[PDB]
Design a protein around this ligand. Structure first.
Ligand SMILES: Nc1nc2c(ncn2[C@@H]2O[C@H](COP(=O)(O)OP(=O)(O)OP(=O)(O)O)[C@@H](O)[C@H]2O)c(=O)[nH]1
Ligand SMILES: Nc1nc2c(ncn2[C@@H]2O[C@H](COP(=O)(O)OP(=O)(O)O)[C@@H](O)[C@H]2O)c(=O)[nH]1
Ligand SMILES: [Mg+2]
Lengths: 436, 253, 95, 102, 430
């Protein structure tokens, strides 16, 4: 009776939702056609993600948005053609061309109304709506712009419903576009006061994880999407599987957000081990939680050793026992390389689930009986904000590429106020981090 | 319609003839004040009229893009043959051939002798206006076909030495006798080898333009004086708001 | 993106999915009756002549049009639209 | 409600706070990532970065930065005199007291 | 959906367009009879970008062929794939321009261009969603450099919101077959820099050098140069026509390649080009593709890219490859050449991936780069222009057809100012 609605906007959001929904279908046993696996053989656990249509198949509680017809048309052609509602894969006619102003003032206005129609058409059906999940690529025009418009409209239309954001900021030095700081800072302004929880998913860190652990020297976007889907499944499995210590979606904001302004945080996962050397180690809960807190395993390119810890939420799925979790937490607390802020004596919220992680054919991970996904709030996140700020100031000093944004209806003063908002956001973190 | 009602006809509906001619445009030279829409539209046609004969005084004739062609026939007598689009507007006008040309010479430029273009360059420079606004103004007026398609609306368009009449659909024209005798005096103009082929680089364009018939249509004002007046007026523009404040009394004197 | 048969010969009143299925499952849209290749040698192999010519002059000069026109099939709309049961069962799909 | 009076004339102006501080950032602009192995090509680094979380990341013999590495190129009197080369000038620097103990 | 139309004019433009349409027909599997025989499904999904569907099941390019002389088009019609082009779009004169800019822009261009404007309007209105226009022509020819520019101005003022592309053949001073090249080239450049949204210059002498040095073939011909130009042309729209890891259309390229409106001149290149007796020895990998991409000899223009600094560049990768190695190589080549990359913009290279390599190939890359080194050719053209203008050579032909030296003075002033403000950013420091 509890439902979460996933919003996928932009090419990155679509391509991560593909893996997420493939993982969900495989984990719940639903065929790509949308049916139970043939005439070979319900626990009513699929209700969190799927809904019964009254005759046979299930329909995912998702909506796809894009202005580029290519990805959506190719999805429609693909083998998951019969799974989604035909009018849930909303597609545009012209791309925003990496322009935030286009997708926020010119093109996205003719599609946001239809998206709102579809989203309320999905929301009125569910009775126990837990919240919303949104996936978008920040370094993209239509992605950031449409995400901004959707968040702004959803806030006023719904009020107290929680929203979770899994954004992908540009990497510190490695990227694919040349104008991404602009729409990056603009979307940062848009989401700062509109999203309740933001989870950092920089690509460079995931490339590092793959190279170091999975021993893959030729990785593509598919591996990154599979890892993100595993993170999402580990986060959500408490809402649909029995466990010894349950945590609901409403029980994350109330434990990881000390103040309303500060809700930016990064995630981690463990174990991430290739099958060639996977279980030639014991994978006790102690070493998997040690690997999770290891700084090199951060899913975002940040060093927690450079700042204090605010709060930590970690969830174990498998055959863990609370006493072992307590022992591991005590060991981590006694460890000196990791330090917590003074006004937070206890900073761990633990959840336990008995559903072991599922494996996908053609994947890279190994079939574990134990796993842990940890999301932490720390003051060290400000380094990415600082390095992103420095990049923007270089181009903006010489009016570089500004005429492309001004000519699309955006006022000149937007950049200055966005810079001020980044400055204030940085203002918050260092002030709260210092000892009283 | 005496070449002035056409100006009124073009102006009173902006939607049917949109363009930059409908509103005033700043002059290229700041020493010249702008002109209102009707005044600048008349000034342009004055300069074009002066431009046409000056080229026509030479052996080279001129034509418009879609309104007739100022040519001449050599056995020198001009006729101002019309254009095909302008010919379509005429209904009872007989298509009598004037200039005898063979099948080889098909384009109006080829069957001509010294065909020109009436470039917007010299016209814009003479009137101290932009090139685009003059071009748009010509395109606005060259749409006399729409007025001509309507019944009646007789036209006697002068713009200088030619005198062309337009009946219901008939076309008939008259020429200045003095200009006609001018063509038949000294017409070295036809051939090209008369010049010693040395002054093409020795003589600058400014010397040729200084002695040209253009740039003498309008009086040249004092650039310093008009700037002094404008700056003085602009000073009174902004700060004359208050009159009460004195801070300098001078009661007795 | 471009379901082929819809535009050139406009399809009549029916569902978009149904007409798309009909114009994709149809023959043609493939196979070489002429055996040319896109690489550019069978063009000089072939002749490029249309066998629908005759003669002219001194009597009639319009000439019959190309084969891009139906024949025999001239048959009224109510005939196609209204038949009782001789169609594929809409919901048969053997299990 | 509202009350009419003379003193309501000449309404008061709007006086907002002048300006908030432009910024304050204590992280350096160029922070080398801990495990960033994007950078180890043509360097004696076994597929891992510094991994020590060092702001500077001092570089030794190989490094990774060159001005004109791959497409660089666009006098008789000038030449190499006595000891301009690396292996010339068989001389040594001067001494320091040293610490060791730390 | 987001389809583009093709406009070609002049002898060089028609020659380029013939080979371009031959390559397009081959890569979409279109026989000279216009019958689709693609081996896959998605060679037909996006075929409407260039091919219109008519009754009888045949496909047709939405191209307009135009010139003042019918001599070129009657020859191109009799060539291979000549039945694809449609004589209804063929508009021709009967006089020609004779390598004169005045004739091809004022007398014959104006009176004849109404019909081609009509046909372009018809095609554009028939198109559902027009992505933009592309035009191929030469600046050393009379009818081309004049009439193509006038048509560009007209279509630009009629569709300001649509994008515009041109593939321009700049004349070269070493191998020059026309003695009046500086005049019409400068005149056409003056209007092109003002009107065209994107410009990509092509040099015949650079093509000669590339063909003789990389391919190492003894007998170059215009066919090979046309083929290389056509491959480079199709490399830009590969991402638009086919799915890929990172889709990118022409609008996205302009945003990422245009820092300021006036700087819209690019040089292009294609990889891999290998001598047929050596690719058994070469290895087709991402590093090899990137190094041949950034090699100066591979550039399609005589300008040396290492004489200036790259403002920005774009790379279009073709083939099933991961974003891993492409972005690694981009970052490495940018870090290793800090001298040649301007420093006040960080990460000035854009990378896009599409999954369709050219037929018979596994991987290929098309390079579009904006570098401050294009000013050199403009300077050398200008120096010839002023030297041959000071003596008033061959100006009687031009002044006998409506123009005066004030237009030339205005054109040369704009070109020199463009060069100055174009090299201004080369020396700029943060
Ligand atoms: N992690 C990850 N990021 C992706 C993926 N696909 C795209 N991105 C991100 O998306 C950014 C560029 O935006 P696009 O995905 O091309 O498309 P967009 O965000 O919708 O914006 P537009 O290009 O205007 O359509 C890149 O910088 C990537 O970081 C993916 O599969 N995985
Ligand atoms: N690449 C290429 N260039 C050509 C071709 N034909 C002519 N050119 C170039 O075009 C220039 C002459 O252009 P021209 O024929 O006068 O152009 P037009 O007046 O518009 O017909 C020469 O300098 C050639 O370098 C061709 O087939 N391919
Ligand atoms: Mg995109």
């Amino acid at each position: 009776m509890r439902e979460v609605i996933s919003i996928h906007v932009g090419q990155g959001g679509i391509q991560v939702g593909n893996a997420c929904w493939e993982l969900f279908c495989l984990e719940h046993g639903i065929q790509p056609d949308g049916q139970m696996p043939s005439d070979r053989t319900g626990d009513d656990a699929f209700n969190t993600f799927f809904s019964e249509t009254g005759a046979g198949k299930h329909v995912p509680r998702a909506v796809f948005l894009d202005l580029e017809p290519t990805v959506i048309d190719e999805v429609r052609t693909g083998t998951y053609r019969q799974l989604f509602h035909p009018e849930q894969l909303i597609s545009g006619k012209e791309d925003a061309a990496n322009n935030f102003a286009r997708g926020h003032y010119t093109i996205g206005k003719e599609i946001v109304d239809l998206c709102l129609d579809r989203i309320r058409k999905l929301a009125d059906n569910c009775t126990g709506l837990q919240g919303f999940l949104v996936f978008n690529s920040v370094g993209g025009g239509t992605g950031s712009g449409l995400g901004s418009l959707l968040l702004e409209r959803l806030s006023v239309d719904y009020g107290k419903k929680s929203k979770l954001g899994f954004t992908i900021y540009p990497s510190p030095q490695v990227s694919t576009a040349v104008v991404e700081p602009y729409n990056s800072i603009l979307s940062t302004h848009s989401l700062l006061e509109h999203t309740d929880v933001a989870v950092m998913l920089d690509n460079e860190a995931i490339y590092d994880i793959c190279r170091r652990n999975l021993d893959i020297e030729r990785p593509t976007y598919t591996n990154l999407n599979r890892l993100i889907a595993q993170v999402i499944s580990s986060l959500t499995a408490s809402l649909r599987f029995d466990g010894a210590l349950n945590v609901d979606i409403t029980e994350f904001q109330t434990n990881l957000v000390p103040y309303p302004r500060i809700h930016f945080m990064l995630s981690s996962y463990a174990p991430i081990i290739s099958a060639e050397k996977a279980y030639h180690e014991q994978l006790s809960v102690a070493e998997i939680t040690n690997s999770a807190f290891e700084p090199a395993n951060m899913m975002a390119k940040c060093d927690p050793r450079h700042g204090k810890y605010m709060a930590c939420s970690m969830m174990y799925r498998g055959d863990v026992v609370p006493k072992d979790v307590n022992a591991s937490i005590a060991t981590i607390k006694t460890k000196r390389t990791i330090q917590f802020v003074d006004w937070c004596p206890t900073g761990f919220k633990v959840g336990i689930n008995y559903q072991p992680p599922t494996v996908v054919p053609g994947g890279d991970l190994a079939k574990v009986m134990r796993a842990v996904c940890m999301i932490s709030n720390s003051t060290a996140i400000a380094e990415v904000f600082s390095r992103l700020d420095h990049k923007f100031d270089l181009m903006y000093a010489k009016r570089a590429f500004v005429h492309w944004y001004v000519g699309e209806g955006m006022e000149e003063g937007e950049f200055s106020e966005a810079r001020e908002d980044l400055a204030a956001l940085e203002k918050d973190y260092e002030e709260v981090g210092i000892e009283t | 319609m005496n070449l002035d009602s056409i100006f009124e006809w073009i102006l009173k509906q902006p939607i049917n003839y949109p363009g930059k001619h409908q509103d005033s445009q700043p002059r290229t030279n700041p020493a010249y004040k702008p002109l209102e829409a009707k005044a600048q539209f008349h000034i342009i046609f004055k300069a074009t009229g002066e431009y046409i004969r000056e080229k026509m005084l030479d052996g080279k004739g001129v034509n418009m893009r879609d309104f007739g062609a100022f040519t001449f026939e050599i056995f020198i007598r001009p006729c101002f043959v019309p254009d095909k689009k302008f010919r379509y507007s005429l209904a009872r006008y007989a298509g009598k051939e004037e200039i005898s040309a063979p099948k080889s010479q098909h384009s109006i430029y080829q069957k001509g002798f010294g065909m020109m273009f009436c470039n917007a360059g010299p016209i814009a420079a003479s009137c101290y206006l932009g090139k685009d606004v003059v071009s748009s103004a010509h395109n606005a007026f060259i749409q006399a076909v729409s007025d001509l398609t309507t019944l009646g609306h007789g036209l006697n368009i002068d713009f200088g030495f030619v005198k062309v009449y337009v009946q219901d659909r008939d076309l008939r024209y008259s020429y200045n006798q003095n200009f006609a005798n001018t063509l038949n005096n000294n017409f070295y103009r036809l051939r090209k080898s008369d010049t010693p082929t040395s002054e093409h680089w020795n003589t600058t364009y400014e010397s040729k333009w200084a002695k040209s018939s253009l740039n003498s249509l309008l009086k040249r004002p004092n650039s310093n004086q008009v700037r002094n007046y404008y700056e003085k007026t602009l000073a009174l523009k902004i700060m004359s708001l208050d009159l009460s404040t004195a801070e300098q009394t001078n009661y007795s004197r | 993106g471009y379901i082929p048969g819809l535009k050139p010969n406009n399809h009549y009143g029916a569902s978009y999915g149904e007409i798309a299925k009909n114009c994709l499952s149809n023959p043609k849209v493939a196979q070489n009756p002429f055996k040319l290749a896109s690489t550019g040698f069978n063009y000089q192999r072939h002749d490029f002549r249309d066998p629908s010519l005759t003669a002219t002059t001194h009597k009639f000069g319009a000439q019959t049009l190309l084969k891009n026109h139906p024949s025999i099939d001239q048959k009224s709309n109510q005939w196609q639209s209204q038949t009782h049961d001789s169609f594929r069962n809409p919901l048969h799909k053997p299990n | 409600m509202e009350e009419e009076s003379i003193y309501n004339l000449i309404p008061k102006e709007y006086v907002p706070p002048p300006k908030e501080r432009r910024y304050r950032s204590q992280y350096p602009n160029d922070l080398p990532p801990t495990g960033s192995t994007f950078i180890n090509h043509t360097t004696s680094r076994p597929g891992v970065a510094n991994l020590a979380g060092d702001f500077e990341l001092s570089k030794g013999p190989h490094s990774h930065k060159d001005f004109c590495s791959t497409f660089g190129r666009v006098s008789t009197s000038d030449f190499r005199k006595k000891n301009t080369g690396t292996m010339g000038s068989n001389k040594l620097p001067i001494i320091k007291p040293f610490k060791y103990a730390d | 959906m987001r389809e583009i139309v093709h406009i070609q004019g002049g002898q060089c433009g028609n020659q380029i367009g013939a080979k371009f349409w031959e390559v397009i027909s081959d890569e979409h599997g279109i026989d000279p009879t216009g019958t689709y025989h693609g081996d896959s499904d998605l060679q037909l999904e996006r075929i409407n970008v260039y091919y219109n569907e008519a009754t009888g099941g045949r496909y047709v390019p939405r191209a307009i062929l135009m010139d003042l002389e019918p001599g070129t088009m009657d020859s191109v019609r009799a060539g291979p794939f000549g039945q694809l082009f449609r004589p209804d779009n063929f508009v021709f004169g009967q006089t020609g321009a004779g390598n004169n800019w005045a004739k091809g822009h004022y007398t014959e261009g104006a009176e004849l261009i109404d019909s081609v404007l009509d046909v372009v309007r018809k095609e554009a209105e028939g198109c559902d969603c027009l992505q933009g226009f592309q035009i191929t022509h030469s600046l050393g020819g009379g009818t081309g450099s004049g009439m193509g520019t006038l048509l560009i101005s007209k279509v630009r003022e009629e569709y300001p919101d649509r994008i515009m592309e041109t593939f321009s053949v700049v004349p070269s001073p070493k191998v020059s077959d026309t003695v009046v090249e500086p005049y019409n080239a400068t005149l056409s450049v003056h209007q092109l820099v003002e009107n065209a949204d994107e410009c990509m210059v092509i040099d015949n002498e650079a093509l000669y050098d590339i063909c003789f040095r990389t391919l190492k073939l003894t007998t170059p011909t215009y066919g090979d140069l046309n083929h290389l130009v056509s491959a480079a042309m199709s490399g830009v729209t590969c991402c638009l026509r086919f799915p890929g890891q990172l889709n990118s259309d022409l609008r996205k390229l302009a945003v990422n390649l245009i820092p300021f409106p006036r700087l819209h001149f690019f040089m292009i290149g294609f990889a891999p080009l290998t001598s047929r007796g050596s690719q058994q020895y070469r290895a087709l990998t991402v590093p090899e593709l990137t190094q041949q991409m950034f090699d100066a000899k591979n550039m399609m223009c005589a300008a040396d890219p290492r004489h200036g600094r790259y403002l920005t560049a774009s790379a279009l990768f073709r083939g099933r490859m991961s974003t891993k190695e492409v972005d690694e190589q981009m970052l490495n080549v940018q870090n290793k050449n800090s001298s040649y990359f301007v420093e006040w913009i960080p990460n000035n290279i854009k990378s896009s991936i599409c999954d369709i390599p050219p037929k018979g190939l596994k991987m290929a890359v098309t390079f579009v780069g904006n570098s401050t080194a294009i000013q050199e050719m403009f300077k050398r053209v200008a120096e010839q222009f002023t030297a041959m203008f000071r003596r008033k050579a061959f100006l009687h032909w031009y002044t006998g057809e409506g123009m005066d030296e004030m237009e030339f003075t205005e054109a040369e002033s704009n070109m020199n100012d463009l060069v100055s403000e174009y090299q201004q950013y080369q020396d700029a420091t943060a």
